[PDB]
Amino acid sequence: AMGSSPNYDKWEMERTDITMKHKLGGGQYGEVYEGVWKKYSLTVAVKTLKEDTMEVEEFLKEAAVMKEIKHPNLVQLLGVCTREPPFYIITEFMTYGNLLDYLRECNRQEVNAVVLLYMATQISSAMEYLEKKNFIHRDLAARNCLVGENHLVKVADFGLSRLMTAHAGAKFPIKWTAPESLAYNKFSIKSDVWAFGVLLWEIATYGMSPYPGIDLSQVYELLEKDYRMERPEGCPEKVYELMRACWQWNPSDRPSFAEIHQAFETMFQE
Ligand SMILES: Cc1ccc(NC(=O)c2ccc(CN3CCN(C)CC3)c(C(F)(F)F)c2)cc1OC1CCN(C(=O)c2cccnc2)CC1
Ligand SMILES: Cc1ccc(NC(=O)c2ccc(CN3CCN(C)CC3)c(C(F)(F)F)c2)cc1OC1CCN(C(=O)c2cccnc2)CC1
Ligand SMILES: [Cl-]
């Protein structure tokens, strides 16, 4: 080791081997960059921090959790540089970028209703895995999902949410946040389930904004009154039923991600 210690972390990579390219989205997505891992001529994505102003503890924790996560539908950690600044987390680069823009911009003949269902199933799978691990995503939404080759979809976290092609709701995603989370700041797997229902709606609509035309300040009250978004055109009724289950007021009454993944397989008869 450079530090002369016998402790080591295999994930820690040499920063000299990374070439830092342009910020993704030209800065709309925070401190995330395209980069090249020169050793493999491999395009990669790199997240960094600005440490004087940012929470280093949170970054280190993020790096740590990512080391524990392996699934086909979860973004793949490649390495970290977390001994000293600048701090980096390095992941795979997903060719087609975030799901929200992809839905908005896609050819609907290719990306038809069936493909939308496939995207949902893939996300369901990822969430089932996180649930088993007892990890809470805390910011599930289309903007945080990624699209790869072969219509592959992965759950990720850009890290923009501040809750303690614009994407206006990225910082304060009130429209994705369960009522208990809003009122009492309780975030849980069950609150992720609520968000998942919103994400299903985003998918079903090809990326429309939720609760269209409704002010942020009126969302909680509407939910409390037992109002919910309507079934999208072309959304299968069974999928809508699932969304509605995800949006039960009491968290206890929402399905588990295990049940949700099971429902998808079963629901259309096989
Ligand atoms: C560079 C980078 C580093 C780390 C991350 N971190 C994660 O995605 C991430 C972090 C924590 C976690 C999990 N935690 C989430 C927070 N919870 C409180 C705890 C659990 C996850 C996941 F939910 F998937 F398990 C993902 C994302 C990063 O960048 C993202 C994903 C990769 N990117 C692309 O593939 C990309 C995006 C847009 C255009 N081109 C490529 C860029 C944006
Ligand atoms: C942009 C925004 C829009 C709406 C809301 N919240 C609500 O509309 C809302 C939430 C709970 C509630 C209801 N609760 C009010 C509080 N009671 C203890 C429980 C019931 C209501 C309402 F009063 F109408 F019923 C409304 C919060 C919003 O933002 C806050 C900013 C501060 N928050 C932060 O996480 C935060 C704080 C400090 C630094 N960074 C983020 C929480 C989200
Ligand atoms: Cl800084």
Numbering used by the authors: 225 to 388, 394 to 499
What is written in the article reporting this PDB entry?
The pivotal driving force of the CML is the deregulation of the protein tyrosine kinase ABL1, which get constitutively expressed and activated due to genetic fusion of Abelson (ABL) gene with the chromosome 9 and 22 [t(9;22)(q34;q11)] of the break point cluster region (BCR) gene. The constitutive activation of the fused BCR-ABL kinase leads to the growth factors-independent proliferation and stimulate the downstream mediators such as STAT5, CRKL and ERK to remain the CML cells constitutive growth and survival. The first BCR-ABL inhibitor, Imatinib (Gleevec), as the seminal target therapy for the CML has achieved great clinical success and several other ABL inhibitors such as Nilotinib, Dasatinib, Bosutinib and Ponatinib have been developed to be used as the second line therapy to overcome a variety of the drug resistances induced by either various of point mutations or the chronic drug treatment induced BCR-ABL gene amplification. Here we report a novel type II BCR-ABL kinase /PDGFR dual kinase inhibitor, CHMFL-074, which exhibits high selectivity among the kinome and high potencies against both the native and a variety of clinically important mutants of BCR-ABL kinases both in vitro and in vivo.
However, superimposition of CHMFL-074 with Imatinib revealed a distinct hinge binding. In addition, Imatinib formed an extra hydrogen bond between the aminopyrimidine's NH in the drug with the gatekeeper residue Thr315. However, CHMFL-074 used O-linked piperidine ring to replace this aminopyrimidine ring and abolished this hydrogen bond. The relatively rare binding mode of CHMFL-074, which uses carbonyl oxygen as the hinge binding, also highlights the new features of this type II compound. Further confirmation with Invitrogen Z'LYTE biochemical assay (activity-based assay) revealed an IC50 of 25 nM against ABL1 kinase. In addition, it also potently inhibited ABL1's mutants such as E255K, F317L, F317I, M351T, Q252H, Y253F but weakly inhibited H396P and almost lost the activity against the gatekeeper mutation T315I.
